[PDB]
Amino acid sequence: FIAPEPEGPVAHRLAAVAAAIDHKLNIRKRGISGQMRDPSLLTFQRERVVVLSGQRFNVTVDPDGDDLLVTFDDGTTAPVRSAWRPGAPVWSGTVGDQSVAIQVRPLLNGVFLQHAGAAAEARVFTRREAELADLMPVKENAGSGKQLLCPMPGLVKQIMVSEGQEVKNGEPLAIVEAMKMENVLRAERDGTISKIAAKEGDSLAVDAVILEF
Amino acid sequence: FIAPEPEGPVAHRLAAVAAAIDHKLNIRKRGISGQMRDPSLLTFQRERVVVLSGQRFNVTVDPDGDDLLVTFDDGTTAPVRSAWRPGAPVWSGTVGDQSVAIQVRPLLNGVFLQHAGAAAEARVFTRREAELADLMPVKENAGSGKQLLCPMPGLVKQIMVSEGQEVKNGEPLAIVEAMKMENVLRAERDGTISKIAAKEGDSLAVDAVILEF
Amino acid sequence: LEKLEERRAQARLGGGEKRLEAQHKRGKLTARERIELLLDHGSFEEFDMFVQHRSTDFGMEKQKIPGDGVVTGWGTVNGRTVFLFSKDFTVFGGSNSEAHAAKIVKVQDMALKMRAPIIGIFDAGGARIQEGVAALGGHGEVFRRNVAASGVIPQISVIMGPCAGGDVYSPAMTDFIFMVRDTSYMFVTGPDVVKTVTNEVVTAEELGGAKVHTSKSSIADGSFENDVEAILQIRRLLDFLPANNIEGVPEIESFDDVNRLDKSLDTLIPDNPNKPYDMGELIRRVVDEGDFFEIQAAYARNIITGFGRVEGRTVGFVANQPLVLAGVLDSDASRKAARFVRFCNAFSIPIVTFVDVPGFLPGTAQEYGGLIKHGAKLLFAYSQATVPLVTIITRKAFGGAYIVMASKHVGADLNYAWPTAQIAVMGAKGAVEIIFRAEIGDADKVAERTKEYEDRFLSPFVAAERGYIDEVIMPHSTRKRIARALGMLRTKEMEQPRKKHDNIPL
Amino acid sequence: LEKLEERRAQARLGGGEKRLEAQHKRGKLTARERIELLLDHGSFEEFDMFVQHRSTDFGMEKQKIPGDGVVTGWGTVNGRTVFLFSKDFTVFGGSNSEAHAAKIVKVQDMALKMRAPIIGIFDAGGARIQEGVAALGGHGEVFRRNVAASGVIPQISVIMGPCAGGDVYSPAMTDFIFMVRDTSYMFVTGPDVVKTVTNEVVTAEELGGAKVHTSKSSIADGSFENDVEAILQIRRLLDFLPANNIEGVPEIESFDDVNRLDKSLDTLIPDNPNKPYDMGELIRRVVDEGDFFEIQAAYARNIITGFGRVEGRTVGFVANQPLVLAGVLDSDASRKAARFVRFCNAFSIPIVTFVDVPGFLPGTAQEYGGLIKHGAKLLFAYSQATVPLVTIITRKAFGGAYIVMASKHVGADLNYAWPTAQIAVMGAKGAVEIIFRAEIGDADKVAERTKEYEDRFLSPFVAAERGYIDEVIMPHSTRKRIARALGMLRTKEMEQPRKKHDNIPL
Amino acid sequence: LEKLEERRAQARLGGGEKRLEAQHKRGKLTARERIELLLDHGSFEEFDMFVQHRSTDFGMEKQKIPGDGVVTGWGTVNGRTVFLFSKDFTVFGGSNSEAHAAKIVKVQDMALKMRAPIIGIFDAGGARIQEGVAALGGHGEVFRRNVAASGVIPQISVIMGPCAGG
Ligand SMILES: CC(C)(COP(=O)(O)OP(=O)(O)OC[C@H]1O[C@@H](n2cnc3c(N)ncnc32)[C@H](O)[C@@H]1OP(=O)(O)O)[C@@H](O)C(=O)NCCC(=O)NCCS
Ligand SMILES: CC(C)(COP(=O)(O)OP(=O)(O)OC[C@H]1O[C@@H](n2cnc3c(N)ncnc32)[C@H](O)[C@@H]1OP(=O)(O)O)[C@@H](O)C(=O)NCCC(=O)NCCS
Ligand SMILES: CC(C)(COP(=O)(O)OP(=O)(O)OC[C@H]1O[C@@H](n2cnc3c(N)ncnc32)[C@H](O)[C@@H]1OP(=O)(O)O)[C@@H](O)C(=O)NCCC(=O)NCCS
Ligand SMILES: *C(=O)CCCC[C@@H]1SC[C@@H]2NC(=O)N[C@@H]21
Ligand SMILES: *C(=O)CCCC[C@@H]1SC[C@@H]2NC(=O)N[C@@H]21
């Protein structure tokens, strides 16, 4: 139904994995060419803040040779070992003692992690970056109207939904043929189909009414 | 009412003046810089064709010291002396024996001449150029739809005409104020004002009806 | 010797007597007649007269017409070397092919190598369908050479017939496009495909006629009544332009006087600030002999661009037109003036700017159309110019419009102002509304402050005290000051920083 | 020593604690907080911290705030030198003035002289009315330096607040404009003047909001949820871009492998010719690690532009999107791709092009909007490019659209084609109709000839036999071929003929 | 049109009739007379005639003289283009200021851009004390222009009065 937010050891493992991924990415990033002076003449901030879908973890990351060590506020240390590389959809490795596999989906300034039935957006900041990010407002979605319009002119070819059917997001609703190419329309909201304006074989202009939520 | 087309001696004088103006312009033009070789190594075609509003004159232009000598088909010669320079609205000089003054206005590939109550468009070609120009069709204007549309949004300032009044071409009809600037509309046809749709002070829109011819 | 002349005559016949007489019946000249009219008498030398196509698909090998639908060569216009190609509508409909494009490529290469103007005359029907992708390859070669020649030699396109499909993209990259009314049209997609796709019924004239491209789409720089008039005007235009980007503008003997005064200009500006005036009148008063070749006269008529002469040398002119849209700057005028200024700068043509502009056109239509970048185009063109820039402010110069219209801050060399100039951030009313926003409810106090602001700031002297205006001149001395300034500025040397090219917004 | 630190703290306070709290109340950061977030820790050096205005009109001398509404300086982003200025909304509303523009001019001069990127953060209210024409002069100086720096150093504008009047023209001539949703807007003319003139009631968001400029007007290259996300993405983009037009693209160590094959690409193209596919999937499967920074993602979605990495080096990508408008080329897509290609060529960024385009968008709306010149802009940009160009045709390449989309004929270095590519003048049906218009009435004959034309010409092999396609490659080796081609083409040397600049249509 | 002529005449008067008379009493020409003698007849075009200082310290705002103590422009000497500036001793003693140095910098930039000789006529009293370090900044800009133009265009300085300090 709705993906649970990670809790307890699952949350700690996700935070450690996110911190390790961020550390690896930062180490790779610091080796960019064209820098003003030698990158080695610079320090890396140990203190990191891992925001795990509205849950903060104050962690410190220290590389243990070929491994990484993540220490939390309560004193728990979770060594992280993996051969994961950016672009791999699955993060496989050991977080402390347990061997885990985590789905990694990148997003803006972070990654999206799924593990043990829990899903959370992971963003790793410094102290000051976390403080500045806390000032940003929480913006709510404006939703959408109950009418499914036709973005482009064309001919309706197929509609898979009927009257009085309940569908959710990410489901096809109609196919519009324009310039010898199909166009699949997907639901932007949820609601039982109350009235269908257009059927198969009907030529519709721009912004024509197709479905009523 | 309608400007008469030149006839007889007036037409001959207008043709001679047009030929002299064309000769002066060509002589000045041949002095342009950047030519491939010396312009003195080129020849000027004596034979010329002067078209005065659908009337052709086959003339030959020969320099005589400072002035020109224009010889027509029927043996007649007309020396042309003037101090006129391009940009001067009036051509003053002697064409043969008579001293004449001719109004000169700019025209596309020619000049517009007025003299002795006669007006004609003067174009001077070579024989081959005249032959090629004779192939061009005569295109007739269509006209307006007896309605004065407002080309820009604004507010009507003043209307100087009433219904059932005769207006000639170019007579102002209404003033439209837009962005702190007056706009004057002029009639594109002739007739009587059937009725007035927009009154002074009304805030019209784009392509709004003002009056019907 | 007689067989060679017989073959020459057969090649000159083109597609046959019937097709030539059909072409003449439509009121159009043939390609060779157009070439003969454009060039000086006896100066035309033709290239590749006997070139034939090598296609063997769909029975094309049974009809081999020499020239392959185009006449190429070189000649002189008023004694100056030019190159030209004229597409023959009677030979396969003028359609582009492999050998057709090869001939055009040869003439383009020679024009670029010799640093001479190249003239394109277009009367065709697109690319030859039977040829296949070879015609597309030849079109691509022509396009690449058009891009290479851009900014080096002037490229003039004369549309004297149909121009559809990939044909239109060759003139679009040239400096100037001229069309003949009622016989020429341009569009990427033809009316048949428009009907089959958009279910819209239009004719060729409605879709891409001369009026459409001269007043709506900004494609064409002008239109002419017929072929003879168009060709004679092309000959006239060639006398204004430099042969390349090195030799500079051509010079002729001027019949006008550079020291003459025009007292009528002292009363050109109306007393009423809401009364417009004709800026073209001022332009034709300033240029030599009143001779002015206007560019894009029917498009974006709130600004004026064109070529004139001062002391016998070509000068570009950009001027706001108060008669149209109060002389404001919108997207169309900005793009038109930007293209003109870029062309003048590329070929070392000095630019004289007359400024009377109250600001930019408001509304959601301008903002949704990208007025920001479109105005930035003109600003970029003016700031990028290294040619002499003489600016004369006549009535108004408000804010960003003042900055854009060749101000001293963007690199103008000399900035004159008439006594009626008003250089300020905005009008007095809006200025006092913004400044004295607390005491907005009053009426007499607001009027008094508005009068004070008008007397103190809406004048050319606040900018003069800051050095932004070099001199406040009498209107009757405009031509004299411009001529002396251009004579002094002929020796200007200036360069932009090294780069492959700039990133002007598109 | 203590008085200096006290003065520094007072200057850092800006317009006061109350105004800073009001700024934080709207969910926006302050100028100094934005600078701190953008740069590396402790790398910021500030210029002109104590600069004050010298205006004495309308009681301005009683309000002297150090900094004059802008924070300027330099720092490092990921160890690389950058320059930046951030307008302070709490100091006179961030409005431009003489000293404000002087500070911006100093930072611009230093950025151009050091050949380093310059970042502009815009949260202001236009130009200061009380300053008068001096603010306009400073704006003009800033505009001139923006034009001078164009094509030499990358210029990035981040709109994090209001931007109205003459302010908008400085970001407009920069390379990239990024906006923050729901808190930033751009327009030349404000809503009040729009209501006064056009009698139209709009808000700031409706007139110039982030959605308007990211999806409708082509002004902005992207929008972000809030300030922190925008600044982090700016850091990412800076890591993507070269420092100037000399050093070349930055290089990092890549975790991806250049010899890996992607078998899923063998089934990307649907069997049905009318079924669209996502070209973004191909782009993200070709780039390193699937990391792709898209440019103008919300505008003209029938084409895709953005930055990726191949073997750790920045590569530009242009690709038709079959999911939107069947992947056709229109004015918006042409202008977007042309600007992207011009930027990539100006800074020596190689471009990889994926081609699937059936032609151009037909209709009177495109022709009246100037589709000829807008389409020619992309062709001009591609033919002008001297950076490596690798083109891969996946499904379709028809007519002039094939020529425009970086064909071999316009200067592309390597042109690959998938086995499903169809390179022809047009579709089989229309080609048969044009060629065999005499016998169009016979249905079976028409079908037979259409099948013959489909078998003969709608394949990548007619172009391969003519040498227009270098190789027909298997879809699963696309990344390997691209990587090897770019590695080989890194040493490409090519130059356009000498000129001030080209005359690309505007 | 008549008010423009009146303003031009008032600007040409410089620092007053009596100061011009004292200048003639010393056997010295005025700046405008020197410019008129140097250039060809009718060839002088003046720049920044109405430029005024923006100083507000020590009561300087109560005396704003157009030109700010220097006359700049261009002309022809024997038909050849030259640029020149002549310091007006009757206006604040000819002392350099921010706008004074701005006018000199403009004329120097134009002379260098047009590749023409530039002539300097010096009759002044150093830098304006009330114009703080802004006067020094303008002096530095003039010095930078002088160094940049060295070896490119001929620079001629005519000392026809006091010249002290910077
Ligand atoms: C340009 C055009 C509007 C003008 O056609 P037109 O002015 O009415 O003249 P026609 O249609 O009678 O064609 C004239 C001749 O030229 C030939 N022709 C024109 N264009 C041709 C082309 N691209 N390839 C081959 N032949 C062509 C025709 O076969 C015809 O031969 P015909 O006289 O024996 O009949 C039309 O020919 C056209 O659209 N052609 C295709 C160009 C194109 O690509 N349009 C965009 C569609 S996506
Ligand atoms: C940009 C703009 C839409 C945003 O205004 P805003 O977001 O609602 O914020 P405000 O209107 O309350 O102005 C904020 C402060 O900055 C000041 N300010 C804003 N712009 C200014 C300017 N151009 N000059 C001087 N001060 C300015 C205001 O006086 C105000 O001071 P306050 O806080 O004591 O009231 C609006 O200020 C504006 O349009 N300014 C003029 C810019 C312009 O040229 N617009 C085009 C009109 S043609
Ligand atoms: C150059 C100088 C020797 C000539 O002075 P002078 O020829 O005797 O003429 P004056 O001294 O009467 O000064 C003339 C006027 O110009 C003004 N003036 C001269 N130099 C000035 C300066 N540098 N700043 C401001 N005002 C100045 C004086 O106030 C005086 O006004 P006044 O006519 O009402 O009295 C002298 O003015 C001087 O030395 N000035 C300072 C320049 C300098 O730096 N010298 C080196 C000292 S370290
Ligand atoms: C009176 O109505 C004043 C408002 C009109 C001002 C005009 S409209 C076009 C120009 N743009 C702008 O901002 N002001 C000018
Ligand atoms: C079937 O309807 C064929 C006509 C559609 C062809 C498509 S529309 C957009 C492309 N442009 C063009 O000329 N042909 C393509």
Author numbering:
A (entry chain G), B (entry chain J): 454 to 666
C (entry chain B), D (entry chain A): 5 to 510
E (entry chain F): 5 to 170
Quote from the publication.
Glycolyl-CoA carboxylase (GCC) is a new-to-nature enzyme that catalyzes the key reaction in the tartronyl-CoA (TaCo) pathway, a synthetic photorespiration bypass that was recently designed to improve photosynthetic CO2 fixation. GCC was created from propionyl-CoA carboxylase (PCC) through five mutations. The enzyme forms an α6β6 dodecameric complex, where the β-subunits arrange in a central core of two trimeric layers, while the α-subunits sit on top of the core and face outward. The biotin cofactor that is essential to catalysis is covalently linked to a lysine residue in the BCCP domain of the α-subunit and acts as a flexible arm that transfers the carboxyl group derived from HCO3– between the active sites of the α- and β-subunits.
Besides G20R, we also identified variant L100N that showed a significantly decreased ATP to carboxylation ratio of 1.7 ± 0.1 ATP, lowering the energy demand for the reaction by 60% compared to GCC M5 (4.0 ± 0.0 ATP per glycolyl-CoA carboxylation). In this variant, Leu100 in the active site periphery (second shell) was replaced by Asn. To identify structural changes that might be responsible for the catalytic improvements of the G20R or L100N variants, we solved their cryo-EM structures at 2.05 and 2.31 Å, respectively. The L100N substitution is located in the periphery of the active site, at a position that had previously been targeted during engineering efforts of GCC M5, in which this position was engineered to be serine. The Asn100 substitution is in close proximity to His143, which was proposed to coordinate the hydroxyl group of glycolyl-CoA. While active site overlays of the L100N variant and GCC M5 look almost identical, we assume that Asn100 forces His143 into a more favorable rotamer conformation for substrate binding and catalysis, enabling carboxylation to occur more efficiently. This is supported by the fact that His143 is categorized as a rotamer outlier in all subunits of the L100N cryo-EM structure, which is not the case for the GCC M5 or G20R variant structures. While the L100N variant exhibits a slightly increased proportion of higher mass oligomeric complexes in MP experiments, the complex distribution remained similar to that of GCC M5 and PCC.
